[PDB]
Design a protein around this ligand. Structure first.
Ligand SMILES: *[C@@H]1O[C@H](CO)[C@@H](O[C@@H]2O[C@H](CO)[C@@H](O)[C@H](O)[C@H]2NC(C)=O)[C@H](O)[C@H]1NC(C)=O
Ligand SMILES: *[C@@H]1O[C@H](CO)[C@@H](O[C@@H]2O[C@H](CO)[C@@H](O)[C@H](O)[C@H]2NC(C)=O)[C@H](O)[C@H]1NC(C)=O
Ligand SMILES: *[C@@H]1O[C@H](CO)[C@@H](O[C@@H]2O[C@H](CO)[C@@H](O)[C@H](O)[C@H]2NC(C)=O)[C@H](O)[C@H]1NC(C)=O
Ligand SMILES: *[C@@H]1O[C@H](CO)[C@@H](O[C@@H]2O[C@H](CO)[C@@H](O)[C@H](O)[C@H]2NC(C)=O)[C@H](O)[C@H]1NC(C)=O
Ligand SMILES: *[C@@H]1O[C@H](CO)[C@@H](O[C@@H]2O[C@H](CO)[C@@H](O)[C@H](O)[C@H]2NC(C)=O)[C@H](O)[C@H]1NC(C)=O
Ligand SMILES: *[C@@H]1O[C@H](CO)[C@@H](O[C@@H]2O[C@H](CO)[C@@H](O)[C@H](O)[C@H]2NC(C)=O)[C@H](O)[C@H]1NC(C)=O
Lengths: 45, 154, 154, 154
């Protein structure tokens, strides 16, 4: 097989540098089971 | 396990760590929600008035404003939520809502000593908003009970 | 009277209902202040980055930003107020301020079992900001008393 | 020493006054952070929709938006901070962090009956952010201890 140079889409120039990056959104709220109730109790106290 | 001063610098530092260990780092994740990642060795002057021309309408100008407002837009949602769950100003808030095995039937240690939060949140991925709805439904059934109490209370 | 899950959906649903009945629906009014009216059957992806062109400076672009910021602008005022009354994170907050017959001389049931909130707020329309001023004046006379206490307390 | 109703109007009114006397005026400084200085004799209609043309992109139009957003931008930072110190909704909040003579070795009265806040904040100018870091490090060591407690608690 033979290869030739291409330069049509500038996005490849940008992909060439950005490949090692990705952006995420942080999700600070979290919910989980626990032996802690509300009002007048946190398991006998 | 690192020091109290490093904990402050380690945003998402207990990401691959076990859920129980992540609790020392709750504040540091919270602070990022508005101010981004913390800066140590250098702390420049972040005051107002740095736009001295018509640069507020440019590409970056608009982009920055969008990023600035979105950042608080989102922060409030998380707060307002905690608020109508009755967990305002709490990084760890106990509720009245009992846990459901259908949501998950893991013991304490099966979770807290075995799972990472993102790992666990992926397990609870399905049942989350429904819980969010119970959390809020609880809060109301509380507020109802208070007015109930104010009626008998002369 | 409807269910706990419907209460969540019923924004302004106790508007014509009696004041005592409105308390189960406090959270649902609060949530609207930032997110607007809740959506049930459909819950699309509300994430960032939907402006892919120079559309942020158009009619709707500007309008949306104005509506977005105004929404939080107002939310904070309501919070900051509750805050300087010492009622932060409370949907029902007791105060130190005694009620005044001049404001209204209706019994509990004459209000809570007989009036709607907008109906009542129209009666208290005149004396409201003055109360808002007492609420705040109380909070200060509290903070004063604390510093007083910190002085005697060695 | 003035009245409770004047205290409300006197923004930065205990600026040259002694630190102990400034506590009655905490709320009035707080309210300014979002709404600016309070208005008494006149209270006009501050509702939305006053931009009836393409005036939102002009000099003042942009300037106002910048000032509006910056105002809340900053307010939240102060709140979020108090929050991760565990002092949410408190105008005076006690902590677990012990005072350090190196920071200052003045007695109560040597401070509260002798200094103005800006005067004192200038003395503590150096050691402030480090304290801000301890305040936050404390809060974490608290949250850690809670999860600790949730483990033994079955
Ligand atoms: C745990 O959650 C599940 C689903 O959320 C509940 O199971 C059923 O949920 C449907 C509504 O989606 C109800 O119509 C059924 O009555 C529920 N089943 C039962 C047996 O009640 C389940 O109820 C929850 N666990 C508990 C203890 O309520
Ligand atoms: C959450 O629920 C979804 C379904 O709504 C699960 O995704 C797949 O759902 C189909 C249809 O019910 C099942 O046949 C597949 O087995 C599910 N995928 C897998 C990998 O089991 C999804 O798995 C659920 N999340 C978790 C963590 O179980
Ligand atoms: C109830 O409110 C009214 C008006 O807010 C108070 O009536 C008078 O208010 C003026 C100031 O606007 C004072 O100068 C008078 O001294 C008030 N009258 C009396 C008899 O004190 C009224 O005081 C309030 N009720 C109570 C119990 O303080
Ligand atoms: C609130 O106070 C205003 C007055 O500031 C009341 O409006 C009218 O005021 C004039 C002048 O004092 C009176 O002669 C009228 O009788 C008032 N209107 C009515 C319908 O009584 C207004 O009524 C007051 N609000 C309430 C709920 O009484
Ligand atoms: C009061 O603060 C000072 C400085 O913040 C502490 O003094 C030294 O701080 C350095 C770090 O900057 C430590 O390496 C030293 O160990 C500290 N000295 C001592 C004697 O501990 C000082 O520790 C603080 N006071 C107390 C009681 O901890
Ligand atoms: C806060 O610390 C700075 C130093 O970081 C003080 O400013 C001067 O620092 C130099 C170098 O250490 C000293 O030689 C000077 O004596 C300091 N100035 C003065 C007026 O003493 C600064 O003074 C400190 N703040 C306070 C309130 O003491």
């Amino acid at each position: 097989e033979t290869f030739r140079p291409a330069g049509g889409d500038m996005r490849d120039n940008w992909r060439s540098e950005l490949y090692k990056y990705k952006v995420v959104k942080i999700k600070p709220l979290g919910v989980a089971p626990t032996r802690c109730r509300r009002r007048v109790v946190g398991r006998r106290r | 396990a690192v020091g109290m001063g490093a904990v402050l610098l380690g945003f998402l530092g207990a990401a691959g760590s076990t859920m129980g260990a992540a609790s020392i780092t709750l504040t540091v994740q919270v602070r990022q929600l508005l101010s981004g990642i913390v800066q140590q060795q250098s702390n420049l002057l972040r005051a107002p008035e740095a736009q001295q021309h018509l640069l507020q309408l440019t590409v970056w100008g608009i982009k920055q404003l969008q990023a600035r407002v979105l950042a608080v837009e989102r922060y409030l949602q998380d707060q307002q939520l905690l608020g109508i769950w009755g967990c305002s100003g709490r990084l760890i808030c106990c509720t009245n809502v009992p846990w459901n095995a259908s949501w998950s039937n893991k013991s304490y240690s099966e979770i807290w000593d075995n799972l990472t939060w993102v790992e666990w949140e992926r397990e609870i991925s399905n049942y989350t908003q429904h819980i969010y709805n119970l959390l809020q439904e609880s809060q109301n059934q509380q507020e109802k009970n208070e007015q109930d109490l104010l009626a008998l209370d002369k």
